[PDB]
Amino acid sequence: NFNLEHPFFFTNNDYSTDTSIKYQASLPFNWHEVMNNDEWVYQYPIGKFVERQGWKIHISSEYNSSHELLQDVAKICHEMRIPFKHLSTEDKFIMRNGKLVSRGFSGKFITCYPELESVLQRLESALKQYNGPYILRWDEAPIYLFPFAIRFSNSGGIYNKKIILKEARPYTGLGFDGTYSSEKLASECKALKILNEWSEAPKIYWHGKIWEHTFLGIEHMKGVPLNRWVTNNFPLYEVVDKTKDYLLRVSKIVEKLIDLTNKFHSENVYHQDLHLGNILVKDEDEISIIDWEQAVFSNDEKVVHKVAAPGFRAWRETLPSEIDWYGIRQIAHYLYMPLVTTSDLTYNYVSQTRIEGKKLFESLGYTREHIDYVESLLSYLDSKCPQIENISRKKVLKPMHEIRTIESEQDIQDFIIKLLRGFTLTYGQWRKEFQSRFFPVHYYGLNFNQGIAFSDLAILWSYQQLAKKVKNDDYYEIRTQVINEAVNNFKKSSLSGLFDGKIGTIWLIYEFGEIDRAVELFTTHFIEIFENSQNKNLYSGQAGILLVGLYFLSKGEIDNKLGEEILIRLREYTLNYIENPETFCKVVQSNDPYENFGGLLYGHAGVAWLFGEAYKLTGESIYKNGLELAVDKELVAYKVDSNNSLQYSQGHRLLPYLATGSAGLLLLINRNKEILSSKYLKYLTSLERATDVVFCVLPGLFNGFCGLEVANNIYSDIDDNFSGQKKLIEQLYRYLCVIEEGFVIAGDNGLKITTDIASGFAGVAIGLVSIMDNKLTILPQI
Template sequence: MGRIVEKHYELYCLADPTFYDSPLAGPDDPGFELAHRTVPGGWARTRKPGAVAYRPLTATPPGQGWKILISARIEEAPEVLAKVGEHCLERELAFGFVRTRPILHLNNAEHADRGSSGTFITVHPAGEAELETALAELDGILGGHRGPAVPGGLRYGKGPVYVRYDGEEGGAGLSPQDGAGAADRSEPSFTLPSHVTPPAFLLPYMAGHDDPAADVPYRVESVLRRTNGGAVYLATDARTGERVVLKEAHPDAGLDEAGTDAVARLSHERQVLERLAGLGVAPELRAYFTQGSRHYLATNRVTGEPLSEVFASRHPLGGAGEADLEGYVEWATEICATVEDAVMKLHMNGLVLRDLDMSSFIVRPDGGVTVVGLEAAQPVLEATGTGFAGSGFGAPLGTVGFDVDRFALACLRFALFLPLTELFLLDRGKAAELAEAIRRSFPLKEGFLRPAVRIVSGGETRLAPSLDGWRQMRSSMARAILASATPERTDRLFPGDIAQFESGGLGFAHGAAGVLYALHVTGAGRYPDHEEWLLSRALNGARGGRPGFYDGMHGVAHTLANLGHHQAALEVLEAAGRDRPPVQATDLYGGLAGIGLNQIYLGELDKALGTASTLAERLPGQAPGGTGLMYGASGPALLFLRLYEKTGDVQWLDQAEAALRLDLGRCAVQADGSLRVTEGRRVLAGLDRGSVGISWVLGELLRYRADPGLSAARQRLDRAARSLFHRQPGLFTGRAGALAYLCRERAGGWGLEDPEAGRQLAALSWHSMTYQGHLAFPGERLLRLSMDLATGTAGVLLAVGGALHGEPVGLPFLSGAMPASRQDAAAVETSRADRG
């Protein structure tokens, strides 16, 4: 649990209340005038979700090098853009800018991605001489304006003009997700690559570029958190030796939904702390001071741990072993009462906490709690709900006064048992269902959730979507998917994850190909009009497209061949291969492993052997950047196993084992005895990156090679799939992936079923929603519905089909879904012969 939502998901929530959608699809805000006016002669304009870029036709597309970054306050943004845009058009300087005021606001929000914080406009000079001239002229033009600081930028002059050297190549410096396209830089200060010598005209500015925190009377020991608005440090008072928490706020940055900046909020927090002094419910104020333009607040350090961390370590449904449910219920109900008592003290002082979630409370060693993060607290007559579930506890729009906190406290009662409260802003009627699921899983007293259900539901009731009967479930999910289709659009056919907007909505993981595949193989039907949408766009856009399986044209071709469009599948792959450098990645998702497996499916064994040989040479020295089935070495291992089955050559079995050991080397045994992928502080169990995918492929290897050590490792990996709690419902990262894994042997036609599958199938109801009266599921982050294969309803359909369908179904290349039928292979060979 935590209040931070990845900024780009929040951005894609703005355009539609039901699905993630491109900001370009939103009809309410056409953007700044430069975003849609007639393009001057000799210029090209590129519009992406969230950003617009202008480039002279005679200029080389901007790449690595010096960039001028300009910030602006929201209210001054149109004027600043008009001045800078006119100047750049006159001087023929390539430039890009954030497309709308709401997106600029979001980029500068407190918990947004710091990579795009501050930057409103990016200007691309052609060299150092042009850089010097442009900096001087822009500084003169923007005199009198101000804006938030740009992380990693060197301020030039007194205004909102900054300069930075970026070593990354890329377009106009504008990404689909980050309005201004700045690289995600965690360092707060201006730095240069070692090979870059700064021009002489920047040296005076670099000499004056000191750390504003250097002169504060505190020794910083560690950074607890950085945000767009500043930072929180653990520090020691150099005068007294007392350890304190030191908060830093930057002006014009870290905006909240009302546009209030971090400095104003920190000043407000000072007033709140003074108001609560001596009550024992909040930290004690030690100091408030300024250093330059930055403001600082110091409080005593409260001993304890955030409730979010205590909860994560104690929650019993995340493991596969026996859990002390009664002990957990006793702790959870006590901590809930303690939190409610603390919030009541704020209410008695006329304050509403407002931004309340599990990270808002420190659990002290004495069992009490201290409220932290009071900058959002408001007087009762001013407090309103945000209408957004970024924290999981956000009250709906229209909620006012103490009811804002009452809604959040009701969410806390749910979240301590099933932390899925983001679903409430999609459907408040979901509260009664989750309450029933909690009562079935925990020995709770009858009345504990009753008031929470009443508050969250707001009187809304509905019939829960049925999970009874395969035919009924299949029909309902298919109807939801079909009802969501937008064949009139060119950027997507079915709404899914935000990743679809990076690849045109065609792909197997997040686009039309995966959805049509799932509908077809589960017996939910063929849809010629939608197949034509995929066919026409694949054939028109294949050249230059990504070649990979889950993110590119091999996945599209696989679906086309599966649907009988064999000639088109070959044409798509032929076009996709033109003028492209060889694929370097080794993984299944977008690299050589997926390509090789699809070559086997298409009957091109010689090509698959060549692909696998290249992969085998590359894999030891270029281990995949990720882990697991989709992004690690388990995907290549799957290709090697299928080649062993095809050829009987034991070298492929050796390669498969070696690859799997690479992924196993990135796993660690957890407290519950399971073996899970560890990446820093993250523990991954999902089908795509985690234990479930590795276990699936390792089980395939053990069919051919007995090894006690590997067999023991697989038993520990297997435990991860038996965890009752999954935060996501989807196929790649959630419960549907565990269900598909548990039914793998059934899908393989061996007549065996895992008894755990029934429990996971029933628990899909925790996430089930309705779309136009039909069964649907939320996507990544649970903030919007999704219909795609990797994160949404189509993936759940495929997994449930693996459990209940009369014929073996599943992901391509795994168990019964591989290899291609003889009829398909023969048809592909016939198509190849027909082509000549």
């Protein structure tokens, strides 16, 4: 809920400052100027009888000369009573009258509240030389009370030969540099009427300024976005290619764009906005460019990039020929692998995702004669854009240049050592600036403190479990601080569950150490965690609380009374299961946890873990009956793929991986070999053809490739571990940054560094344990 940008981490909305030019009134006594909202300077005067403050009057302003409106408005206040209040700084002026705010809070810069004669001529006589930012009638001045809808805005809009409608009402859409939308409509009116020879660019029709509104209407071009072409045409599955002839299809895009980009550099026009929402590929691979809103008609000036898409912003000032060659660089690298999203934080990002590409095509098997071609075309693009310096302290995130293969277990020995150091590093850059949480985390879980999730001590348990999995600073003092902090705030939290709730930290007060303190905490608090109805899912609900309770019962340290009625609670809960499966979970796309409604962790297959867990230590028939329904009703939402596979279908997106995909059910079948019949054990063949893809963008255990490999290489009845680790290691090298002697992992929507079990350091640290230790140690098995 709290989106803000900081160099490295995310932070909640308490970090930003207001270092701007302030506004100032110079008014006499019997008026207050006391601030109360940090927006206005709030004034109710002295010696009053204040009215009920009904219908209000309003005055608006423009950025061109508003050091002269306020001073003339302030000299009206010497005569008569008025609630005079203006805005604080120019930053609130830009935000109030600019890009994305509502229509109600736009145009307001100075305030009068109507008791009076409702008219005064000397304010009308010192003004009406200023007119602009109208708000959508009693007098003159600024007072505001045809030759023929995909993105609404208060500034303008885009509305559906059929023609599109690009418009801009006057004096709006102010940026940090003072330019407007109608100031760039004329920029398109120059920049596309200067070149009408080409067929890959529309025709300008300014039809009329009805009222006074700047319009620019261009016809609908034909083509597809290049992202959809990549995800519909990249060799994800290994046989979808038409016996090669795709890296030659790359040569159409990597020749047409180069042969077109040098020809508008001879017309003194530079487009300066080059991302993947502009290049539209027609049928029979014809290209088309759009959105010429940022065209500067100069070469010797230097502009730092202001508005772009995520991925392709320039770095610390360059000549504007380079702000169109940088796009042709990082889009011709985009076709090779789809990995450019991190490049807003990491500069010169495409070296490691271009080195591994030749290794990818030689492993899949392509002819070298076709391959040695695009590697020279990309080498030609290094001549145009020069090396620039990395400033603004996003500069430590350094991509690797050398990558070596895997030949022994010592590769896994040093991988863990170079992964654990990048947890001390990302703590040492978080503790020095903030103190609300204690470890950095992905932005949606930015205020959570409990359970196996976006957390504070689950990541510390993941830190020590792999550190004990490997052999040989300040673990114990931070250990003592977080253990005391957890037990201090164990109350006053209003959520219950295993991954997010209260009994999760009961599990890690057991497993983290401190065996006794866990059992008086359990005997004190388990019943008032339990009894209060609520939900049923393993992420947050009664199955999460109950299963770690039976883990405690089967461990062997419990009194007889608790071992009686806790087993009575699970005997009750499985009988309340009986026939109705829609109670716990549902039988659109996102990457945040709470709006998902299916999978292993968020869905039906979590209850299957409990039903398979109870059968050992019980051995009775009803817990066998519940298990196969719990596996079968998870597979309702699976559709047969194009080539003999099964995936989770949520919207247009296709879902691999552990949390909400085929991998969790594959792992759950792979564990329970003995109780499952031959009809359900034969589904390994279809799911193994699903969980072996060559590319999946997210790196985490809860999201992406680590969940794909930890489902395959875990049980298998075979003690082979080296081939179980080698594939995940060699195909997780393309998702890593390098900070000092160590690695970090950027989370989903990657512009960050994170530590969590929901796509960060700790997720791969659990998965690499679960490869060799064969338990999946963050899910209760006993």
